[PDB]
Each structure stands twice: as structure tokens, then as C-alpha cells.
Write a protein that binds this ligand. Sequence first.
Ligand SMILES: *c1cc(=O)[nH]c(=O)n1[C@@H]1O[C@H](COP(=O)(O)O)[C@@H](O)[C@H]1O
Ligand SMILES: *c1cc(=O)[nH]c(=O)n1[C@@H]1O[C@H](COP(=O)(O)O)[C@@H](O)[C@H]1O
Lengths: 257, 257
Amino acid sequence: MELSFGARAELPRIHPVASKLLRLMQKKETNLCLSADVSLARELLQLADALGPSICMLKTHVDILNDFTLDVMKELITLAKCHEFLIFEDRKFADIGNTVKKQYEGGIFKIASWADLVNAHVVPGSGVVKGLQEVGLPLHRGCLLIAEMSSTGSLATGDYTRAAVRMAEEHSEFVVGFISGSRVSMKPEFLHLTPGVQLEAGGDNLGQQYNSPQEVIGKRGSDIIIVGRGIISAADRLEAAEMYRKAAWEAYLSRLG
Amino acid sequence: MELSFGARAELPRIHPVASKLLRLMQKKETNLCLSADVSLARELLQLADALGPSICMLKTHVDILNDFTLDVMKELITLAKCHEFLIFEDRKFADIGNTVKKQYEGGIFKIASWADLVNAHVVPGSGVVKGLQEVGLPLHRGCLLIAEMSSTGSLATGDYTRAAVRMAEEHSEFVVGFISGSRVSMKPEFLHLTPGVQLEAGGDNLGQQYNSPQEVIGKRGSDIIIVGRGIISAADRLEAAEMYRKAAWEAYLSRLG
Ligand SMILES: *c1cc(=O)[nH]c(=O)n1[C@@H]1O[C@H](COP(=O)(O)O)[C@@H](O)[C@H]1O
Ligand SMILES: *c1cc(=O)[nH]c(=O)n1[C@@H]1O[C@H](COP(=O)(O)O)[C@@H](O)[C@H]1O
């Protein structure tokens, strides 16, 4: 039974951050997450402001921003609130629980302070979730687990993927979904976000593989497309965002009915 | 056919960074890596200077330093050059090649500018290495691949571990060894570094598991112990560093002859 995003936002077991996301996706007719892979704060903020109305989420790698400051993140939060999107830091935590707690809370980035969502690899065991959870829980944050990767040679397959799904189910108080190439859980309260998405066929020279919105959302049953270069490399990033938005939304509509 | 660290440093296929590390290990009679998990630059620099004579390597998590600057790294390098230890940033890269490249060279940390060694998870496939290599090779750096983890429920086992070893052998121009719990390659050009080490049996509250230096170096055939809290939490950190050094060094001597 396929439910709309709006309905899924009202599921009994839904995390408040997931419900906030699903509600705005429904309101704005977007299941597009912009992967804002830029190195300048000015470009990041200009993108967030211009594309804000077209996206449900903005994915960051703050560790590549050459002029990061917490004030940059303050201005980002302002735009997120104004245009209604969540902020997802793609930190891909992959260390023991005691370490990731500090990497999430502390340092120069203070990620937990501005990021609605973060994600984690499951290779260290559930301790990685337990550690992030100690920080994220009171702050009403959520976490995505990396069940599959988009890159050539990915070891996130078979039993590895299954362990990711189990770990998510076992920590549903904080884990709100997956980074994956397709649906991996049948529980509707879990979000599926998919990177490796472009309108055109291809990859890059460093192992990335691309599939289309239609394939990923329609055929593979994912919820949200994550798109970097497909948008960022366009001359007009707003036009490109709209293109990806309409693709992903219609693919979702067709799956519904 | 086991060779001393001094002999391994001279092997024809040895990477320069590994050779430099092996020679100072022999000179100083230390196969101890200090895990300097502190949140203040002052404390990082203090520990590095005080414990420098006892260690072959200092392992950092620069993303937990509340007051990182590149000047703090310039100074760390001064101490490293004075006391003769390498700097290892335990960044645990786990993203696609295109992204890790920028995370290694760029952002606020400029890791590649100051870290002799970094490490990477193998889960994304070999693109994670090819990306890092593009930055590391020009800068004369080395990389360790994460073949096994110390934590409860680690998925870095069996075929995953084998994939890590193959990935290393196929990228021997940049990969100089492994993060592992035991010897996983029979090639003497590769280093093995093992975290999860304490004199006493135990673990932490978030999935860390500990084995002793004698078990890890002696029985399991690893080269270098990585120790954080075992030293930092002791009342006398110098005496603590010396106990771990002497344990690890004696275990190496006994295995050798
Ligand atoms: C994360 C996990 C994964 O499996 N694949 C990925 O590509 N990523 C991150 O998503 C973004 C893809 O951007 P693009 O290829 O559309 O430009 C990127 O930031 C990568 O780190
Ligand atoms: C990295 C990989 C691994 O498998 N296990 C690890 O513990 N780590 C890192 O090593 C350090 C262990 O420190 P301690 O438990 O001796 O204090 C820590 O920095 C962890 O991130």
C-alpha cells in the first residue's frame, strides 16, 4: 500500500523531523535534495536562496567549505526556515561510538547545532548509532544509515545492506531512514534517499554511477533524489533544479496511482 | 621470514613514508601510536611534546578540536620533526572519490597539507582510494585502509577484509598498510596498526573492545598499537606511554627472535 508523503507524515511511529520533512515535500511538491557541493559560502547561500523553493532538503559537506563559519550556518538556517527545507550534513560518520559523538557535537563545525539530519555508515556496528544518538536525541535530530552506495565496487551489498536495515529498525527513535539506491525497508515511516542521480546516462572518472529520477523513484521505490553535479554544473541551476524536481515528483505520483 | 622494522624500511617496494616511520621506530624503540583525542589545541600540543620521545606516531581527530587553526598544525609539525614521529589524521574517509579528494585537500582543515598519513574505509569501492591518491601522491603522503574495526558488531570481516587487502595491493604507490586487529597481509612492505588496545581487559560504554599489546603485536602479528584513553586518562601520562611502548616493543622483539 503506497501512501502520499502527506499521509506518511502522520504515521504513528514517525520521527518529528521525518514528519516535518514529509509535510513540506507534500506542500511544495518536491522530493529533490540539492547536493550543494561547492567550496564557497557565498555560492552555497546563493544556491540555497534561489533553489530553496524547489527542494525539500539541502545536503552539505561543510568540511569542503573553504570559508566555513558558524555564521554561514546561521544564514543557511534562516533560508531553510524561510523557504522550508531541511539541512542534511553528509558527514558519513564511520568511527566508534565514543568518537562520533564528539565529531557530531563538537569541534569547529558543531554539526548537531545546525543540521536537521546526518548520516552514518554501519561498518563500525550499532555503537556508531548509539554515539550519535546521545547528542541528536534531545536536539530532535535524525539520522540516515548508509545501506547501499552509488559507487563502483561498493561493498554495501547483501548481508551488509540487511545489517543496515536491522540497525535502523532497532534504533527507530533516531534513525529516520536510509541512504540507498532503492527501497530497502518495507516500513513506510523510513525515508529512502538516493544519490547517484542524473537525467543523462553516465558516471564520473572516480567511480560514481548515475541512474535517472524515473528509475530511482518510479522503478526502485526510493523517496528522494540527491543531486549534485546534475544541477550544480548547469549554467542555470534554478532551471536545472526545476527539471529534477518535476522528474522526481511525477515519478512519485505515478508510483502512488 | 620476518624482518626487523629497520630491514623492512629498506625493502625495494617500500613507500617512503613507511620507510621513514620504520626507521624512527627502530631508532627510538617504539611501535606505539598515541591517539591524542583532546578538544583543545593546547592539550594536543602539550601531549605531543611530552610524549613525543615515547611514540612513533601521533594520531589526530582534528575535527574534534574546538580551536583548530592551520597554525596549530604548523606547530604540531615542528614537534613531530623535533621528537621524530609521524602525524596520522584518523579521518576515516568513507565517500565517493570525487568528494574525498576535496575533503582531503580542502576545506578549513587542509588535511593533506600536514598529515603524513590518513585512512579510508573500503566500503565505497576503490574510487575512494583513487580520489585520495590524486591529492596524496603529489604531496608525498600515505594512506592506511580500514580492513577490520575494533568495535562491537563491526561488519569489516571476511570478504570485506579480503577486499581491503586487495585494494591495498592494487594501490601500493599510495597505500602503505592497514587499520586492523591482526596481520591481514603477508607482504612485509605493508604496516599494520591496531586500535582498541589497553593493558587490562575491557571496553567502553559505546562498543569499543580492548586487547593487550602482547596479544595484538605478539599473537596477532600487528606492527603498531594505537592507544588513547589507556594513556590520556592515566594520572601519569608519561609513565603510561612508557608502559605501552615497552609492552609493544617487547612483544615485537619476541615475535622477531
Ligand atoms: C554519498 C553516498 C553515496 O553512496 N553516493 C554519493 O554520491 N554520496 C554523496 O552524494 C553526492 C553525489 O553528488 P553528485 O554525484 O550528484 O554530484 C556527493 O556529495 C557524494 O559525496
Ligand atoms: C578507529 C578505528 C577502529 O577500528 N577503532 C578505533 O578505536 N578507531 C579510533 O581509534 C581510537 C581508539 O582510542 P582509545 O579507545 O584507545 O581511546 C579512537 O580515536 C577511535 O576513533
